[PDB]
Amino acid sequence: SAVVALTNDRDTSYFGEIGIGTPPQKFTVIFDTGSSVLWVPSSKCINSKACRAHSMYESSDSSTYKENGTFGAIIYGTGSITGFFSQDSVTIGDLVVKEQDFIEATDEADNVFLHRLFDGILGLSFQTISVPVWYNMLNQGLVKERRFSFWLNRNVDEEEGGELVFGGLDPNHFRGDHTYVPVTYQYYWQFGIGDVLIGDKSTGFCAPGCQAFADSGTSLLSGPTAIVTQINHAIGAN
Amino acid sequence: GSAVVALTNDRDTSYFGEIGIGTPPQKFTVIFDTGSSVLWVPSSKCINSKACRAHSMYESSDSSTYKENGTFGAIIYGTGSITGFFSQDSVTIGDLVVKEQDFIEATDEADNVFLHRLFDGILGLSFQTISVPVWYNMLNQGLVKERRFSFWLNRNVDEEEGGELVFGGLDPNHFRGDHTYVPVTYQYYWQFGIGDVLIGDKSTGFCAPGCQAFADSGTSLLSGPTAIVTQINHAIGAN
Amino acid sequence: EELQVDCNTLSSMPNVSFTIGGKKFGLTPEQYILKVGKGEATQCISGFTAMDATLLGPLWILGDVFMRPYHTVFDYGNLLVGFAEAA
Amino acid sequence: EELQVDCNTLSSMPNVSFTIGGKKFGLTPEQYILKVGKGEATQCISGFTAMDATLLGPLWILGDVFMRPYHTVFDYGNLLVGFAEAA
Numbered sequence A: 001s002a003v004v005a006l007t008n009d010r011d012t013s014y015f016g017e018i019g020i021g022t023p024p025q026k027f028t029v030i031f032d033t034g035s036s037v038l039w040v041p042s043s044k045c046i047n048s049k050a051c052r053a054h055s056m057y058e059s060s061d062s063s064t065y066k067e068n069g070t071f072g073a074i075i076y077g078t079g080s081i082t083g084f085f086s087q088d089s090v091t092i093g094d095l096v097v098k099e100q101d102f103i104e105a106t107d108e109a110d111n112v113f114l115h116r117l118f119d120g121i122l123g124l125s126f127q128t129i130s131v132p133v134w135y136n137m138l139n140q141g142l143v144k145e146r147r148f149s150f151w152l153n154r155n156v157d158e159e160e161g162g163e164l165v166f167g168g169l170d171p172n173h174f175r176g177d178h179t180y181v182p183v184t185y186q187y188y189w190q191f192g193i194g195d196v197l198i199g200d201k202s203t204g205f206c207a208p209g210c211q212a213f214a215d216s217g218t219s220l221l222s223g224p225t226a227i228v229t230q231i232n233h234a235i236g237a238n
Numbered sequence B: 001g002s003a004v005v006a007l008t009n010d011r012d013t014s015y016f017g018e019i020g021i022g023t024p025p026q027k028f029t030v031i032f033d034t035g036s037s038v039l040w041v042p043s044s045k046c047i048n049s050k051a052c053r054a055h056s057m058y059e060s061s062d063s064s065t066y067k068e069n070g071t072f073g074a075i076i077y078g079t080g081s082i083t084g085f086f087s088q089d090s091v092t093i094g095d096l097v098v099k100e101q102d103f104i105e106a107t108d109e110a111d112n113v114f115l116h117r118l119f120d121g122i123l124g125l126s127f128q129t130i131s132v133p134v135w136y137n138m139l140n141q142g143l144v145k146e147r148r149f150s151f152w153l154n155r156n157v158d159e160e161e162g163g164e165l166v167f168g169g170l171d172p173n174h175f176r177g178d179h180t181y182v183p184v185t186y187q188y189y190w191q192f193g194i195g196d197v198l199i200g201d202k203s204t205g206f207c208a209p210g211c212q213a214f215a216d217s218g219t220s221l222l223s224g225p226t227a228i229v230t231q232i233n234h235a236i237g238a239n
Numbered sequence C, D: 001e002e003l004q005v006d007c008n009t010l011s012s013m014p015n016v017s018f019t020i021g022g023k024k025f026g027l028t029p030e031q032y033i034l035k036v037g038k039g040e041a042t043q044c045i046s047g048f049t050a051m052d053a054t055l056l057g058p059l060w061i062l063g064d065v066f067m068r069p070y071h072t073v074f075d076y077g078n079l080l081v082g083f084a085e086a087a
Ligand SMILES: *[C@@H]1O[C@H](CO)[C@@H](O[C@@H]2O[C@H](CO)[C@@H](O[C@@H]3O[C@H](CO[C@H]4O[C@H](CO)[C@@H](O)[C@H](O)[C@@H]4O)[C@@H](O)[C@H](O[C@H]4O[C@H](CO)[C@@H](O)[C@H](O)[C@@H]4O)[C@@H]3O)[C@H](O)[C@H]2NC(C)=O)[C@H](O[C@@H]2O[C@@H](C)[C@@H](O)[C@@H](O)[C@@H]2O)[C@H]1NC(C)=O
Pocket: A068, A069, A070, A085, A101, A129, A130, A131, A135, A136, A139
């Protein structure tokens, strides 16, 4: 129902375009399955150079904007945003999501956000404080399937960086059937996993069972010390 | 057409849109300008220039497809000037990726002219002078179907788009009737011959034997021979 | 050069036409006058500025004032410029 | 963490597999090593970082290193996550 082309930044972040407002003001965002808020930099960003290095949202230039003003803040896995909630139409691919709430950020940590190519983040995890973009998609009947999917390509100068599909799957980007596992805790997109093996060696710690979530907004793998030390030792990483 | 660029209208006096330069693409706001032929953006190496520091800059060391050039480049516009050096990178416009595009990264910019404007740089669409323009590389690389590009410029209003540039075609939703086509008479600007200029049905006489004009999306107003403009401004009571 | 007009008098200003390809391309006052500022503080500026340059003949620059009411096609393959009423 | 490996030694590194839904999801060294830079100045970073956190049980974050070789489906209607070999 909607395809979003993604840019691969050095294999460490992936982002695509969205529009906010009428007419659409364009933003580059990370589509992040590990977080639940939508924020972009505000036109009202006083002294956050991060904000001024990036595309800014101007509610006065949008005919579908509806004020909210509620205070909002987010403490990421390193950094954090603050601003106020606003409502506008958000355009994604062919989809127009109405009455979508987002934070227009009036402060951002520069250390974290200034040296990044994306403007903001579109959270795809389960709802916390605001109805996320996806839930609105569902509520407004805009998707054919209650599913979204990611293809993330390797970092290759002349290739597409990846592709996100709302409301379906792109069969050109996988082989075989998907192996599906139930969500075990609805916060992140979290599920159960078993043993983690080095070659056919067991690392033991997760053999009785672990948890994992799939986080497109995270670069690497993060896991239990007991297993990671084994892996990093085995492969001779510092 | 193979690529559509949405334009922002700033107070009816400038129109601009987005491009990316580099891998991954660094973003810039640029005027698409049929009155000039060079592509330039502010350089990360900008030398005592306040205009740069307030605008988005290009950092060659952040781009994996950057190729050094370093040839001196300068541009004296219809107001002031920018100076820098040539570099080469991929230029992303809409979903086209123009490879091997040369552009100036400006290390000095005329603050009086560029410092307090909403765009970062300029993408020239006129005929080649010192470097192969973006449009020619587009064509060369087969990125467009038709060897044409077109502009819809809207009035300055709040619920509406500012405008739309189409590379490689037309948008029929933004015109009525057939286009009247005239041949380019001097290949520098997109220049063509014109006839008499009339105030109502009154001839202004001076261009009756034939004058020249070029279409300049990077210019705000209409500029012309004093001998005619004086008459028009008198007629409308400007002063 | 930043000539202003009385915003009240656009309804008694004439159309100004350019002949191109033998065809008249008119501009109405509402098109050739630039509005600056808003609602009540608005200033009305003449869109016609004087500039004397010659390249084959006396030269006009048809900037945004003209390219707003006329949709413009730049035909590189045939080296043509085309104008039609914008919509 | 930010541990590095000798870029010349990936050819003999082991695959690392995650068991999910009873199926082994392997990662090759080419997949689990993050390369920074090109040809000569390339740095090779381990994609495995330590983080001791619990939500119900010991928790892994499977980021882009995993989501590249495995195409991922987020099934909201059925509350499932699905993985297939990417192409
Ligand atoms: C300014 O912005 C904030 C942030 O977006 C707004 O606050 C949130 O608003 C949403 C609605 O868009 C809230 O979510 C909704 O919650 C209800 C259930 O209520 C929850 O809290 C109740 C009491 O406070 C409690 O009774 C209940 O059990 C539960 O914990 C859902 O029914 C509703 O879901 C339905 O609609 C959505 C889509 O709209 C669908 O996805 C669902 O399937 C259902 O059809 C939705 O999930 C959210 O909880 C609010 N969070 C916070 C902390 O603000 C704020 O909205 C205004 O204030 C809130 C508190 C509500 O009263 C709004 O109705 C109210 O407008 C914004 N201000 C305004 C006025 O726009």
